[PDB]
């Protein structure tokens, strides 16, 4: 550990451009392993990682049925959201849901999540105690009253404590070689002159897993965290990640700067200089 | 492949209005229409529709199975593949059938219900259609017996997505896309899994209450005529209660705002002397 399992639901209406679409994706840590798209010939839960491909037919049947039920429920949920906010039936809207569990080293439940948004803004979310809800507005308060009357929180808690954790364990076991062994970043520093009086130092980290990493620039041992440029961590395409961090330096001061790289695939923190 | 759609409904009464839209290459672009009788003759003599095809007012001639092709100049044909088929059914041409629920319209979550459509008129087909924008009807072949033709539509497992106002239609041979007048509407309502309210006696007045924050309460006499509404009032003891002032057997349901076809599980039956 520690590890996480997450599911992401996207439900979207698109009047005139197609029937309502439901997309679900499953993640263990930073690795996607399942997907479901309602816009196919025959919608089925499909594998997206090699270590889940050898699960039996019962797994895929059950998951496909559950996803069909979910798709129907969230199409209806779009229809409901329309009434809640008194919106036109000709507009395109989106519900997003993410839920799952964080477990620790031994593999026991550390935290549970279940949050949902409407049109990109928070709608309603399960609290840390996994027995109560937090709503962002009046419509979500209606939903809260419903879910309290239906005792959805108890069921969700029962799922997060039970199936989510156990299946997370099974997944972590299935692809341990790829999921539980970190791959250190291959790293280097490049120099790019801006002018004759200043240049850019860029610190590169490539091919690392998992996605969490820290890249910092230091001048004489002090972080230049304000005048530093960070890019979003990006996927390489083969379940590994890339990132870099740049800083603008005066000509002849390259020696003063060092790039620091921390990643769980490294035994000791990394320090780099350009020459 | 273009996406063809009918708005607000493919099932449309005579004198009503329905618009066909053909969405292709991120546009509601110029397109041609085609029927199912022979698929490559464009209707209205090759008419290329500019924006969208508004049929208004709808006549029986508008009924049929449509497919559209969008314009695509930089291509061998210059036109796209045939789109998804959309069937426009016109209603109000025959006497209405009857629609009945077995065992009843109130269906508890997870269970099934039978919607029976029948008529004295020998309808060849029956169509079950739920009220709502962008909804497709189900079809069954009429079974002939004892002078009446009938059909049993199965609906389940009951979820909110299946709740709403249902109407059935009939179609006679040689006019498949021509439907009868709609049967009288049947409101299929889901009950549960929301917790049941308590129903007790406070001339007598029946009070039904709950810890849950229902927006209103429905009182119903078992074997009665109409249901009695009453808004839930947040009491001092934090309970939500409704007081129905008044022999027989009564039941109480809770319900929320902006949710017309779902109720809580019914309260225990209350015997009033």
């Amino acid at each position: 550990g520690s590890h996480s399992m997450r599911y992401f639901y996207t439900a979207m209406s698109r009047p005139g451009r197609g029937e309502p679409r439901f997309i679900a994706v499953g993640y263990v840590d930073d690795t996607q392993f399942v997907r479901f798209d309602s816009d196919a010939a025959s919608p089925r839960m499909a594998p997206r990682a090699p270590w889940i491909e050898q699960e039996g037919p019962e797994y895929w049947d059950g998951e496909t049925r559950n996803m069909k039920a979910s798709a129907q429920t969230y199409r209806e949920n779009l229809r409901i959201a329309l009434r809640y906010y008194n919106q036109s039936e000709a507009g395109s809207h989106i519900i997003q849901v993410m839920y799952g569990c964080d477990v620790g080293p031994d593999g026991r439940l550390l935290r549970g999540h279940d949050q949902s948004a409407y049109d990109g803004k928070d709608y309603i979310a399960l609290n840390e105690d996994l027995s109560s809800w937090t709503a962002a507005d009046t419509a979500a308060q209606i939903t809260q009253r419903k879910w309290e009357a239906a005792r959805v929180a108890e069921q969700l808690r029962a799922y997060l404590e039970g199936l989510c954790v156990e299946w997370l364990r099974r997944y972590l076991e299935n692809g341990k070689e790829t999921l539980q062994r970190a791959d250190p970043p291959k790293t280097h520093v490049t120099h790019h002159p801006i002018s004759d009086h200043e240049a850019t130092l860029r610190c590169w980290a490539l091919g690392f897993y998992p996605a969490e990493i820290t890249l910092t620039w230091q001048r004489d041992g002090e972080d230049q965290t304000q005048d530093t440029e960070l890019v979003e961590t990006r996927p390489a395409g083969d379940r590994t990640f890339q990132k870099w961090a740049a800083v603008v330096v005066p000509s002849g001061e390259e020696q003063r700067y060092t790039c620091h790289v921390q990643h769980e695939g490294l035994p000791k923190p990394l320090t780099l200089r350009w020459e | 492949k273009p996406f063809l759609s009918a708005w607000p409904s493919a099932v449309v009464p005579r004198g009503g209005h329905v618009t066909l839209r053909c969405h292709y290459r991120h546009r509601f672009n110029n397109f041609m229409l085609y029927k199912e009788d022979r698929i490559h003759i464009p209707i209205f003599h090759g008419r290329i529709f500019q924006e969208s095809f508004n049929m208004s007012p709808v006549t029986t001639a508008h009924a049929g199975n449509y497919t559209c092709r969008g314009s695509h100049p930089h291509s061998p044909t210059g036109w796209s593949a045939p789109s998804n088929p959309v069937v426009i059914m016109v209603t109000g041409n025959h006497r209405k059938p009857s629609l009945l629920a077995h065992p009843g319209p109130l269906v508890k979550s997870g269970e099934r219900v039978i919607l029976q459509c029948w008529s004295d008129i020998m309808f060849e087909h029956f169509f079950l259609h739920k009220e709502g924008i962008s909804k497709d009807p189900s079809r069954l072949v009429g079974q002939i017996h004892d002078g009446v033709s009938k059909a049993n539509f199965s609906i389940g497992p009951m979820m909110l997505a299946l709740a709403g106002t249902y109407r059935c239609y009939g179609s006679v041979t040689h006019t498949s896309y021509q439907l009868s007048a709609p049967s009288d509407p049947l409101d299929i309502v889901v009950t549960g899994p929301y917790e049941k309210p308590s129903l007790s006696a406070q001339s007598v007045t029946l009070s039904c209450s709950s810890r849950s924050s229902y927006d209103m309460y429905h009182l119903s006499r078992e074997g009665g005529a109409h249901e009695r509404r009453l808004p839930a009032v947040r009491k001092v003891n934090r309970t939500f209660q409704a007081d129905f002032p008044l022999g027989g057997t009564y039941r109480c349901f809770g319900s929320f705002r902006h949710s017309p076809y779902e109720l809580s599980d019914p309260s225990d039956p209350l015997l009033v002397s």
Partner: peptide
Amino acid sequence: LSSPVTKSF
């Protein structure tokens, strides 16, 4: 494994 819990708005 995804959640079997129905989330009706």
